[PDB]
Design a protein around this ligand. Structure first.
Ligand code: ADP
Ligand code: ADP
Ligand code: ADP
Ligand code: ADP
Ligand code: MG
Ligand code: MG
Ligand code: MG
Ligand code: MG
Lengths: 349, 349, 349, 349
C-alpha cells in the first residue's frame, strides 16, 4: 500500500485533529502525572477511550513516564496550570500532547507500507519565525505509545519526507470551502477567514485574481498575539474574585467550566457573573474589529465573504457579527477547520 | 565591439520596454516600499517575475532601499499616488521605474567589450524643455539592482554616447512603419499618428516629400497637455461618489479597475457605471477630434491613413473612429508603439 | 549577500574549473614568461582567450609580471619544466595557476559588496597534511589580474567564509550522483570511485548504511602517489629513444602529444609506438586493480557500482574495465568529475 | 454557461478531429517553418484552408512563431521529419498541433461565457502513466491563434473541469456502437476492437457481463508499441534504396506517397515496388494476428464481433479479416473511430 496521512492541530486551547480516514479526535490541552487505575475501572466503565487517556510513553533511553492527559488531566487538581503554559514548541509537554493523537488516529494493524505523513501547523507570523524548531523536533521524534486500560502500542517515529507544515487556517479556505465558494468568488474580491483561538487569534484573507485563483495577503493578515479566548478567562477570574471577595480562586477546571457556563457552582451556590460574561465577550470581539480594520483600510469595501472559525468564534458569532452583517457567516466546524484545512490542503501529499 | 540596446518608455500610465532580443516587458508606474517576503512564497507562485517585483536598490553610497513596483506595488495600501505622481524625470521614483525595466531586459553575462545603449522618450513639447535634466540623470546613473526572491542582479552604470534622447512618438512612424508604409504613401501627403498617452496625448504628423521621405511639421503636431486617460480616471471618480452618495473614494487599485471595465464591486454588491464610461470616453474622443482640427484645416483633407497609438488608443477606437472614417486605423501594438518605435529608430546608431 | 561560487581544481596535469553559472574551462598547468604579442596579433586572430592566455598579474606591491600560461606556454620551448614540477601548493606556479582560472571564470557585472565562494581541492591522504598550507595561501591571496589581448581585468582577493576545502573525489560521488545513486544504493554496500589523474591516483569508497546515508571508510581508501598517467609519459619517452635507435628524445610538447596518439611525426616521418602505448596503458591498468584490491579484500563483493574519474580513466576505461565488469562504469565528465562535485557540495554555504 | 464540445486526437500519423457540430477535420501530423505566402496567393486561389494552414500562435508574453503545418508542411523539404516526432506529450510539436484543430473547429463568434470541452486521448498503456503529464499541459494551454491568409483569431485557454480524458480506442466501442450492438451482444462474450495506428496498434477487448453491459479486460488487451504503419514506411524506404542501388533517398513526401501507392515516380520513370508493398501488408497483418492470439487463448472462440479501425485498418481490412471470417468487420469511420467515440461519450459530461 501507500503511506498514511495524519492532520492534527497544536492549538493551546484544545488539541484537535482528523486523520486520512475521517476519524477525528479532540481534547483540551491539559496534561498531568499518571497513576495506575484499577479501582475506578471497577466502578465506572471507560466507554470512550479519549475520555480517560492514561498513557505511558516509551523511549529507547528508558525514560518512560505515566501521564494523565486531556479530560483525565482536567479532573486532576495537580495537573498543568494551563494559564501560563510555555509556547516552546520543542518542549517535552508538547511531546505528550502530540504523541497522544498519533495512536488515536492510527487504526489497528496498519502494514509497514503505511508511513504517517503528519501535517501540523504554526501561527501565521510564527510560521516562518518558528518553522525550524518544530522541524527539528519532528525530525527528532522517536517514541512508542502505551494505552493504559486499552493495551495497544504504536511505534511512532518520523523521517523526513513525512512531515508537512502549513500556517494556521491556510488551507481552511484555500481548500475545504474553495470548491464551494467558487459560486461566490468572482473577480478581485477578498474572502475573509478568522480563527479565534485560546492564546492567539488569526485573521487571514486571500485575494483572488482575474483568473479566479486565490493569492495571499501578508499585509492584510497577521497574528493577534495576546488577544484571544484566554483574555476572557483572565477577565472572568478577576470578576470572580470581585464577586467572591475572599481571595479564593477557581482551579484549572472551574475556570474552564466558567466561560462555557457563566454560573460557577461555588460553596454549594451559583455565584453568578452573567452580565460580566457578556461584557467580556463584547470586549474581545470589539478589540478584533480594531485589529481587523488595522489591517483593513478602504479595502474592506471589496469583501464578499467573511468566515469565522475557532472555538472562540463559536461563542463570539453575534459578538463579531458587527464587522459586516449579511456577509459574515460560520464555517461548518469552527474548531476543526484548522485540522481539515491541514488535511485537505495536506492532500497535496 | 557593438553595444547592446534597450528601449524603454517612461510613460505615466505604464512602463513599457524592449531590448535587442525583442523580449518585451510591461508594468504599471506604481511603486511601493519593499517588505520582507518569505511567507507569501509558501502560499502562492513566484514564477511570474513581473507580478512579484520585490527589489533591492544599491545607491551611489551603496546602501540598500528595497521597493515594490507595479503589480506587487498595486496591491499595497501605501503605494505611490499615481494620480498626481510627479512629472519630474529626475525623481527617485523615476529612478525605481528606470532601473527596473532595464533589469528584466539586460541579458545574463553580456560580453565585456559590449556595453549598453538606452533610447528613451521625452514629451514633444518638453523635448527641447526637459532634455538636459534627463541627460544629466542618465549620465549620473550608477546603481546596482538586485531582484529580491528571484535572486539575480545587475550593476548598471552609463556613460555619455550611450544614452539617446528622442521625443515621445518620434520613431514610432519614422521607423517601425517605414518598411511597411512604402506601399501605402503616395506623394506630398500626411499620415496620422495619435498617441493617446495617460496624462498627455501626443499628436505627430509627417509630410512625405517628392522623394517619398517623411519630413516633420511641428505646426500641425503638438502635445495635448492635460488631455488623456487621466481625465477618464477623474471623470468616473465622481461617478462612483455620486452613485454611492457616501464619500466612497476608490483606492488606486479600484480606480484603474473601474475605468478598465466600469463594473466596480463594492461591499457585497456591484456598482455598475458602464453607461457613464461611454460618456467619459465620448468626452475624451471629442476632446481629440476638436483639437485635431486646430492642427488640421483643409490640410486634413490630404491624408492617406490615420493610425492611433497609446494604451488609451486601444479603448477609444470605436468612438475615436469619427476623426476620419475609412482612413483611420489602429497600429499593431498600441502599447508597444513607443518602445519599438524607440528601438528601431534607436538602431540608427 | 548573494555570494557567487567558483569551483576549481589544482590538478598537476591540467587545471579544471567551473563557476556558479556552469561556465567551465580546461587548460594545461604550464607557465612561462609573457612577451609582447603584437607581431602575431596582426598575423592570426587572437580569438580563443583560453588558447591564448597572455596574462598580466599584479601583486600587493604592484609588481606586474606578464605570463604565457596554458596552451600558449606549452607552445613555448622555454616553458615550465612540468614533469618534475614541485608539489608545493604555495608555489608561485600555483599562485599563477589558481589566479589564472579565477578571472577566466569571474563573470561580468558583479555587485559592490558581493564576494565569491571559492571551492578548491587537496590530495586525499595529504588533506590532513596540506590543509594549513592552502589555508595559508588562500588567506594570503591579494592580487590583481589583467588580460593582455582581450582588454579586461578583474580584482582578486579573498578571506575566510569564501574558502571551501574538500578533498579530491570527496564531493564527486557524494553530490553529483546524490539523488541518482540514491535509487541504486540500498543497504550496506560500497560505491567505488577511482580518480586516475596525471601524477596521483585516488581510491575512495563510501559505505552506505541502513538509513541510505553514505559513510566514509578511510582504510579502504587511499591516494596512490607515484601511480598515474605520469608513468606512461615517462615510460614511452625512453621507448621513443628505443624505437628511434639514435638516442634522440622528444620535447615537453611532444611528451603530451605522444600518449594522446602514439604516432609522433619525427624527422619527416611518423615514428610508430602504438604497440607500446597499448602495453603501458594495460600495465598501469594492471597496477590500479591490484592496488585497488590491496584495500579491497572480499569487500569487493560488497560493491554495487564503481565509477572512475580523472582524465586518465576516460582513456583507460577499456583496460580499467577489469575491476568488476558491468559494475564498473565511466562518469559522464571524466575531467570535470571533481569540479561539479566541488560545485554542488561546495554550495552548502 | 453551457460549454461546447470538440473531440481531437494526438495521433503521430495524422491529427483527427471533430466538433459538437460533426464538422470534422483531418491533416497529417507534420509541422514546418512558416514563410510569407503572397506570391502563391495570386497564382493558385487558396480555397482549402486545411491544405494551406499558415498560422501564428501567441503565448501569454507576445511571443509567436510562423508555422507551416500539415499538408502545407508536407510540401516543405525542411519540415518535421515525421519519423522523429517528439514523444514528450508537452512538446511544442504537440502544442501547435493541439491548437491547430482547435482553431479550425471553434466556429466564429461564440459567446465568451460559452467554453469548449476538449476531449483527448493517449495510447492505452501510456494513458494512466502519462495522464498527469497531459493534465498539466491542458491547464498550461493558454494561447491565441492567428491564421495567415484567412485571418480569424481564437482565444484558447482552459482549466481543469473543461477537459476530458479517455484512452485511444476506449470510447470507440464504449460509445457509438455500445447502444447499437445490443442485438449482437448477449452474454459473457468478447467484442473485438483493434485500432491500427501509425506508430502503435492498439488491442482492446470488452467482456460483456450477465447484465448485457461491457466490462474491461486488461490482460487480454495491450498496446503494441512499435507495431503499426510506421513499420511499412520504414520497410519500403529500404526497398527503394535497394532497388535504386544508388543511395537515392525519397523525401518525407515521397515516403507517404509510396505506401499509399507502391508506385513512386523517380527521374522520368516509375520505380516499381508494388511487389514489396504486397510484402509489407501481408507481413504486418500477420504480425497483428500473432500478437492478438498472444493475448487470446481459447477465448478467441468466445468472440462475437471483431471491429477494426485506424487508417491502417482501412488499408489492411482484407488481410486483417483472417482472424475470423464473418466476424472481422470494419467500423464506419476508420480514421474518426476515436473521434466520434470521444464525442458521444464526451456528451456524458
Ligand atoms: N462550547 C463552548 N463554550 C465556551 N467556550 C468554548 C466552547 N467551545 C470552545 N470554546 C473555547 O474555544 C477555545 C478553543 O479554541 P481552538 O479552536 O481549539 O483554538 P486553538 O487552536 O488556539 O486551541 C477554548 O479554549 C474554549 O474557551
Ligand atoms: N485593457 C485596457 N482597458 C482599459 N484601459 C487600458 C487598457 N490597456 C491600457 N489602458 C489604458 O491606457 C493607459 C496606458 O497608456 P500608455 O500607452 O502606457 O501611455 P503612457 O506612455 O502615457 O503611459 C493606461 O493608463 C490605461 O488606463
Ligand atoms: N583525450 C585524451 N587523450 C589522452 N590522454 C588524455 C586525454 N584527456 C586527458 N588525458 C590525460 O589525463 C590527464 C588529465 O587528468 P586530470 O583529470 O586533469 O587529473 P589531475 O586532477 O591529476 O590533473 C592528462 O595528463 C592526460 O594525459
Ligand atoms: N488511403 C490511404 N492509403 C494508405 N495509407 C493510409 C490511407 N489512409 C490512411 N493511411 C495510413 O493510416 C495512418 C493513419 O492512422 P491513424 O488512424 O491516424 O492513427 P494514429 O491515431 O496513430 O495517427 C497513416 O499514417 C497512413 O499511412
Ligand atoms: Mg487554532
Ligand atoms: Mg506614451
Ligand atoms: Mg584529479
Ligand atoms: Mg489512433
Amino acid at each position: 500500500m501507500n503511506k498514511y496521512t495524519i492532520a492534527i492541530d497544536l492549538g493551546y486551547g484544545q488539541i484537535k485533529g482528523i486523520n486520512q480516514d475521517n476519524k477525528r479526535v479532540i481534547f483540551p490541552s491539559i496534561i498531568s502525572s499518571g497513576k495506575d487505575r484499577s479501582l475506578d475501572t471497577f466502578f465506572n466503565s471507560i466507554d470512550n477511550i479519549v475520555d480517560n487517556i492514561h498513557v505511558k510513553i516509551l523511549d529507547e533511553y528508558f525514560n518512560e513516564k505515566e501521564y494523565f492527559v486531556g479530560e483525565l488531566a482536567k479532573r486532576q487538581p495537580s495537573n498543568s496550570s494551563f494559564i501560563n503554559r510555555d509556547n516552546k514548541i520543542n518542549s517535552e509537554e508538547n511531546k505528550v500532547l502530540l504523541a497522544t493523537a498519533l495512536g488515536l488516529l492510527i487504526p489497528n494493524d496498519l502494514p509497514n507500507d503505511t508511513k504517517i505523513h503528519i501535517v501540523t501547523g504554526l501561527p501565521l507570523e510564527h510560521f516562518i519565525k518558528q518553522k525550524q524548531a518544530l522541524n527539528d523536533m519532528l525530525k527528532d521524534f522517536e517514541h512508542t505509545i502505551k494505552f493504559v486500560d486499552h493495551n495497544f502500542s504504536r511505534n511512532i517515529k518520523f523521517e523526513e519526507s513525512n512531515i508537512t507544515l502549513f500556517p494556521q487556517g491556510a488551507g481552511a479556505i484555500f481548500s475545504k470551502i474553495n470548491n464551494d465558494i467558487s459560486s461566490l468568488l468572482i473577480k478581485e474580491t477578498f474572502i475573509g477567514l478568522i480563527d479565534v483561538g485560546f492564546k492567539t487569534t488569526d485573521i487571514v484573507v486571500f485575494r483572488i485574481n482575474k483568473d479566479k485563483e486565490p493569492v495571499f495577503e501578508q499585509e492584510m493578515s497577521a497574528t493577534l498575539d495576546g488577544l484571544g479566548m484566554i483574555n476572557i478567562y483572565n477577565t472572568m477570574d478577576k470578576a470572580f474574585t470581585d464577586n467572591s471577595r475572599d481571595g479564593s480562586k477557581l482551579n484549572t477546571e472551574q475556570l474552564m467550566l466558567l466561560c462555557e457556563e457563566g454560573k460557577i457552582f461555588f460553596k454549594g451556590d451559583y455565584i453568578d457573573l452573567k452580565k460580566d460574561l457578556i461584557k467580556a465577550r463584547k470586549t474581545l470581539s470589539t478589540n478584533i474589529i480594531n485589529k481587523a480594520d488595522g489591517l483593513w483600510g478602504s479595502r474592506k469595501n471589496s469583501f464578499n465573504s467573511i468566515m469565522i472559525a475557532g472555538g472562540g468564534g463559536k461563542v463570539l458569532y453575534n459578538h463579531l457579527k458587527l464587522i459586516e452583517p449579511n456577509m459574515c457567516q460560520l464555517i461548518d466546524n469552527p474548531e476543526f477547520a484548522n485540522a481539515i484545512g491541514y488535511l485537505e490542503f495536506g492532500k497535496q501529499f
